[PDB]
């Protein structure tokens, strides 16, 4: 890892030398990916980086960023009571989770009647859902 800056500089110089060789960072996987015209092309470039630029590198299959989804619908409840110590906290929600049409993305609906959930906290509930979904639930 001490040669990562050398690796970046070598990649820049090699991209200037060779239009068809590309290097980019993938945000989701945090990996640096090199794209080329073929196995021979990438092998030659890897050896050239190792020797000419003195940065020994290892190459592998790029990681695939998977996702998660719910296959079944269900009404669920979440309650949190923390009155025991010092400041007391209370929260409660009833949410129906449904498998959305594939590719439609997350959809939050507010079927609150009678102000049982004050309108102030509904955006907070949506944000909490967004964060908890950003964090995986299965893998």
């Amino acid at each position: 890892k001490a040669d990562q800056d050398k690796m970046t500089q070598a990649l820049v110089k090699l991209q200037e030398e060779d239009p068809t060789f590309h290097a980019h960072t993938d945000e989701e996987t945090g990996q640096v990916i090199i794209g080329g015209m073929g196995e021979l092309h990438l092998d030659i470039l890897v050896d050239r980086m190792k020797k000419e630029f003195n940065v020994e590198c290892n190459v592998g299959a790029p990681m695939v960023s998977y996702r998660e989804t719910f296959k079944s619908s269900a009404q669920v409840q979440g309650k949190f009571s923390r009155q025991s110590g010092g400041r007391g906290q209370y929260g409660d929600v009833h949410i129906e989770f449904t498998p959305n049409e594939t590719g439609a993305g997350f959809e939050f609906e507010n079927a609150i009647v009678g102000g049982v959930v004050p309108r102030e906290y509904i955006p907070s509930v949506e944000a909490g859902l967004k964060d908890a979904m950003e964090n995986g639930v299965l893998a």
């Binding site: 990562q4 800056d5 970046t8 960072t25 945000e27 945090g30």
Partner: protein, 135 residues
């Protein structure tokens, strides 16, 4: 003090510290050592890019980058302006000037230098954010 006391032990002035220590140091790779040299800016590579929460009473998601400088010192540099195109491994220029809200952020990333892009849609005080004249 008496004049004799001053003759024996002369007066001693307070020593002044820099607000941007990381800019005062260069690195010689051949000798593998540090050297004292004042630079107005230093190049670096963004080790991390993200957001930080300011200390109270302020509240925000302030954009910053952890940068390793050309002298191998790792610092936190604020990203000024609205919107930026910086990621890990981006090569950026860093100048002095801390962000009072952000505790460990003591430098700024220059806009419109090296990889960093100018602020999109900026029209007043453009030179401070590296935005070309729209005309």
């Amino acid at each position: 003090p008496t004049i004799n006391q001053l003759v024996r032990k002369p007066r001693q002035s307070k020593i002044k510290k820099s607000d941007s220590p990381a800019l005062n140091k260069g690195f010689n790779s051949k000798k593998k050592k540090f050297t004292d040299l004042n630079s107005p800016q230093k190049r670096g590579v963004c080790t991390r890019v993200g957001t930080m929460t300011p200390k109270k009473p302020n509240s925000a998601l302030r954009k910053y980058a952890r940068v390793r400088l050309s002298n191998n010192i790792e610092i936190n540099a604020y990203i000024p302006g609205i919107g930026h195109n910086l990621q890990e491994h981006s090569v950026v220029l860093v100048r002095g000037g801390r962000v009072k809200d952000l505790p460990g952020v003591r430098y700024h990333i220059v806009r419109g230098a090296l990889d960093t892009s100018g602020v999109d849609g900026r029209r007043q005080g453009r030179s401070l954010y590296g935005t070309k004249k729209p005309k």
